[PDB]
């Protein structure tokens, strides 16, 4: 169909969608709006945020919801309700992890922000990176359902965004996560997209 | 099929699951841990948080992922992929709304917290409540897919928690949302549950 993605000129929450559409070998317009273009676009987005993926004229939003839908379209979802649960559960956990990082990163009060630095690095980050690595090992190198799913694509696609905010390489000391990253980035459709895409830090 | 729910002695993020199980005419152990016991429970949860739902022994977590699953079990999901996407998008949007509220409410610094009050009350709350009201009206009194779905159970179940944090009845002046609440709370299984459940401010 006709796909048009609208998002920031970075990877972040748009990248999982770009990863998935690529893997599905679907052509899509990759519209990246300029900084001064946003006040113009915001009012026409369903809840004033992006990513927004137009699918045959119809607006869709929410990076996770879209990723799940596209996952089912391209054969990357569970075989049954329970596998889809396992996928959904771990991705919402990725979101919790992102929220913990973003809570420091986007904090506008320097005093309060600095207060969150130590806890993030000393408790939160080590905890999740470990738990996630355990989960990956337990599924034989995947995040859920003992196989490659749209969660692996979502996770790896936003990883640079997570690293940038956390100011560290989150999977460097986590071998199963590191291998999952290498694996997903190693898939041809992704490898091909990654060599094409604009380089950004997020 | 056995069910055992583990969560705080409040409504909040556990309530959606209690609502759906009730609606599905399923008995379940509603375990509510005491404050002093949490330090020892935490490590036994998949990622150190509740709600956790044991489904025939198998642990599940993440309020939204669990609700999507149960919703499909009890005939409260989409007829196809597009409809389930529609439901998914509106629920993740509710999560965004909750995060904006929670950002103020859990701000431990009275200085940063106060900066967040006015924007929350003047911009965020009116924005989301009006938008959700439009959607519910445009869907004939439901949050998605023109029919009752698990989105409606999720929204109404957490609404008190949202009201407590926002320090106001958020739907008091949104008639389509107010009618949705009364509709869900009206349901026999819910009404029975609401009468039976321990009462809390959130």
Curated annotation (Swiss-Prot), chains A, B:
Residues 80-202 form the GST C-terminal domain. It comes from Blattella germanica (German cockroach). Keywords: Allergen, Transferase. Belongs to the GST superfamily. Sigma family. This is Glutathione S-transferase. It is an enzyme of class 2 (transferase). Glutathione binds at residues 7, 38, 42, 48-50, 62-63. InterPro entries: Glutathione-S-Trfase_C-like, Glutathione-S-Trfase_C_sf, Glutathione_S-Trfase, Glutathione_S-Trfase_N, GST_C, GST_superfamily, Thioredoxin-like_sf. Residues 1-78 form the GST N-terminal domain.
């Amino acid at each position: 169909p006709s796909y048009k993605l609208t998002y920031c000129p970075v990877k972040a929450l748009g990248e999982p969608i770009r990863f998935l559409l690529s893997y599905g070998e679907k052509d899509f317009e990759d519209y990246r709006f300029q900084e001064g273009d946003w006040p113009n676009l915001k009012p026409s987005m369903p809840f004033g945020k992006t990513p927004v993926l137009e699918i045959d004229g119809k607006q869709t939003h929410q990076s996770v919801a879209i990723s799940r839908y596209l996952g089912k379209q391209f054969g990357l979802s569970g075989k049954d309700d329970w596998e889809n649960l396992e996928i959904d559960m771990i991705v919402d956990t990725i979101s919790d992890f992102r929220a913990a990082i973003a809570n420091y990163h986007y904090d506008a009060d320097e005093n309060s922000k600095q207060k969150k630095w130590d806890p993030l690095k000393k408790e939160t980050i080590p905890y999740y990176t470990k738990k996630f690595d355990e989960v990956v090992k337990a599924n034989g190198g995947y995040l859920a359902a003992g196989k490659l799913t749209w969660a692996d694509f979502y996770f790896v696609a936003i990883l640079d965004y997570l690293n940038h905010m956390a100011k560290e390489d989150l999977v460097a000391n986590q071998p199963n996560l590191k291998a999952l990253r290498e694996k997903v980035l190693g898939l041809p459709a992704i490898k091909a997209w990654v060599a094409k895409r604009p380089p950004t830090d997020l």
